[PDB]
């Protein structure tokens, strides 16, 4: 019996292909949902889709779980989430010599790279920024480097992953601003299978309690920069 | 229409009576669930009940939500939880001149104060401590100070609250040990109460986003000492 998971595998360190993009799907969220599946005695099956098509596949029952989804009011009304399993902080990233962008408000009438069909893309359009649509976070940062855009709103997790992979490029960017709060991130499912949701939850707590959560987290993130969520009790 | 909430009102800063016992119910978790009920146009009705009977009362349908409950896999199997709204850290507290307790393992054959029917009382019993059952955290700590017990396992929130009330007392206690992670705390409901749980989650999100959570949190806690949990994103 299968746990069907939708992802886009061009998003290190969440979901990506080993061997410089040529081998097996791996990443924090990939390893976690695999462990979840393993402990539920389910066969995991992955299905890879461009981010703008991820929620559609969930809606039409092509798969049953999406990974690394930020909880928002509208999504909570329409879908079921797991307990949060990580938190990210939205950053405003610019070239290191940029001077006229000091706040999210400053993005009005500036050129900003975002991913089509994402909430940060929606935010940028609402600020009356000028969008250039990228296919993932690596490309948003490349568009920023190359001067196609003057900023990108990007969560900390993929930004710091880029600095870890490309340290000599780090000096070309700076954080101009950050959201005042971090954001809970969870697995997202269609409403109406409370049973699967409660099962994933119980298993996520088990994974915290036995040290496996910390193992997987420290494989992919630096604990001094990226926030974890609380553990559980027994 | 009512939201029935079970609580024991002798647990500052969570749930306690104003004017040293004579006034209305107040505290962090009380104000929070009042705010949630208010946004749902529900009248709250509180059912004061000793901790040993809180979960019993929920099972008995005497009320519909319990506040300040630690998530455990054994509870996640049997009950619905809201998204977490705070975290605590379990501390092993002894008198500052206690000599032979340096780890939870050292509690075997020690006398320890714990609250009847709690998970931490169960853990003390598993360690083969000798149990002195206490009626609440204040009594746990008073048992310790008066040398009627030699330890108590207590979460940081009520332990700091005791010190805030007694600011020359710092040096009467020491923290001998602490759990390795903090512990997610949520509202707990009967299993299958999925529409109430979803409503509470939506309202908790809304509270995090409009600054209400921060207002309530800061009324009761020192943000440098007590952990909050991640925010929801707009």
* Contact residues for A182 (Cβ-Cβ < 8 A; gap 6+): A87, A88, A89, A227, B230, B231
Q: Residue B116 has which token pair?
A: 């009847």
Please report residues of A whose CB lies closer than 8 A to that of B73.
202-203, 205-206, 209, 232, 234
Could you tell me how many CB contacts below 8 A there are between chain A and chain B? 110
Residues of A in contact with B185 (CB under 8 A): 230
Cβ burial B67-105 (10 Å sphere, 16+ → b, else e): bbbbbbbebbeebbbbbbbbbbbbbbbbbeebeebeebe
Which residues on adjacent β-strands are paired with residue A41?
none
- What is the rounded distance in angstroms from the CA atom of residue A103 to the CA atom of residue A108? 10
Q: How far apart are CA A189 and CA A187, in angstroms?
A: 7
Report the 10 Å Cβ neighbour count for B58: 22
- Looking at the complex, report in whole angstroms how far the Cα of residue A207 sits from the nearest Cα belonging to chain B: 10
DSSP secondary structure code for residue B172 in this structure: G
Q: Nearest C-alpha of chain A: how many angstroms from B2?
A: 22
Partner-chain residue, chosen from A84, A119, A205, that has the shortest CB–CB distance to B83: A84
Beta strands in chain A (DSSP E): 2-7, 10-11, 15-17, 25-26, 43-48, 65-70, 79-81, 86-88, 90-95, 111-115, 130-134, 152-155, 173-178, 183-190
Paired tokens of B18: 């104003």
SS3 A187: strand
Residues A64/A159/A13/A29 CA torsion (nearest 10 deg) = -30
Half-sphere exposure of B65 (CA within 13 A, CB side): 28
- With helix as H, strand as E and coil as C, how does B28-95 read? HHHHHHHHHHHHCCCEEEEEECCHHHHHHHHHCCCCCEEEEEECCHHHHHHEEECCCCEEECEEEEEE
Question: Per the structure block, which two tokens stand in for B87?
Answer: 């975290």
Chain A interface, best mutation among B36, B181, B218, by max A CB count within 10 A: B181
Q: Which experimental method was this entry solved with?
A: X-ray
Q: Would you call B184 and A227 a contact, using CB atoms and an 8 Å cutoff?
A: no
Q: How far is CA B102 from CA A15, A64, B106, in A?
A: 42, 47, 6
A65: β partners? A5
Q: Which residues of A153-172 are buried (b: 16+ CB within 10 A; e: fewer)?
A: bbbbbbbbbbbeeeeeeeee
CA distances from A214 to A28, A143, A155, A222, A230 (A): 11, 34, 21, 11, 11
Give just the sign of the alpha carbon dihedral B161, B153, A213, B73.
negative
Phi, psi for residue B150 in degrees, rounded to 5: -110, -10
In whole angstroms, what is the distance from residue B185 CA to residue A229 CA? 12
Region of A192 (left: φ > 0; alpha: ψ -120 to 50; beta: rest) is left
The CA distance from B49 to B53, in Å, is 6
Cα–Cα distance, A99 to A103 (Å, whole number): 11
Q: Please, what are the domains in chain A?
A: 1-85+186-221 (3.40.190.10), 86-180+183-185 (no CATH)
Chain B partners within 8 Å of A77 (Cβ): 202
> What's the first-to-final CA gap in chain B, in angstroms?
30
Query: Which residues of B touch chain A, with CB atoms under 8 Å apart?
Result: 70-74, 76-77, 80-81, 83-84, 87, 90, 119, 180-185, 191-192, 194, 198, 201-202, 205-206, 208-209, 227, 229-234
d(CA A224, CA A39): 29
How far is the alpha carbon of B124 from chain A, nearest alpha carbon, in Å? 13
């Amino acid at each position: 019996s299968a746990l069907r998971v939708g992802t886009d595998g061009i998003y290190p360190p969440h979901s990506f292909h080993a061997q410089d993009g040529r081998g097996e799907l791996t990443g924090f969220d990939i390893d976690l949902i695999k462990e979840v599946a393993h402990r539920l005695n389910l066969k995991v099956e992955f299905f890879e889709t461009a981010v703008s098509g991820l929620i559609t596949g969930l809606d039409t029952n092509r798969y049953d779980v999406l990974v690394n989804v930020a909880i928002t009011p509208e999504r909570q009304k329409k879908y079921d989430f797991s307990i949060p399993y990580i938190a990210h902080r939205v950053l405003l990233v610019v070239r290191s010599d940029q001077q006229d962008i000091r706040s999210f408000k400053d993005l009005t009438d500036k050129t900003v790279a975002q991913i089509l069909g994402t909430d940060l893309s929606r935010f940028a359009k609402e600020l009356k920024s000028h969008l250039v649509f990228s296919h993932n976070f690596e490309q948003s940062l490349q568009l920023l480097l190359s001067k196609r855009t003057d900023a990108t709103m990007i969560p900390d997790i993929p930004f710091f992953n880029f600095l870890e992979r490309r340290p000599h490029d780090g000096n070309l960017f700076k954080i101009a601003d950050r959201m005042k709060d971090n954001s809970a991130v969870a697995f997202m499912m269609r409403k109406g299978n409370n049973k699967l949701t409660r099962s994933i939850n119980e298993i996520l707590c088990a994974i915290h309690l036995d040290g496996t959560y910390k193992k997987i987290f420290d494989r992919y993130f630096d604990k001094n920069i990226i926030s974890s969520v609380p553990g559980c009790s027994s």
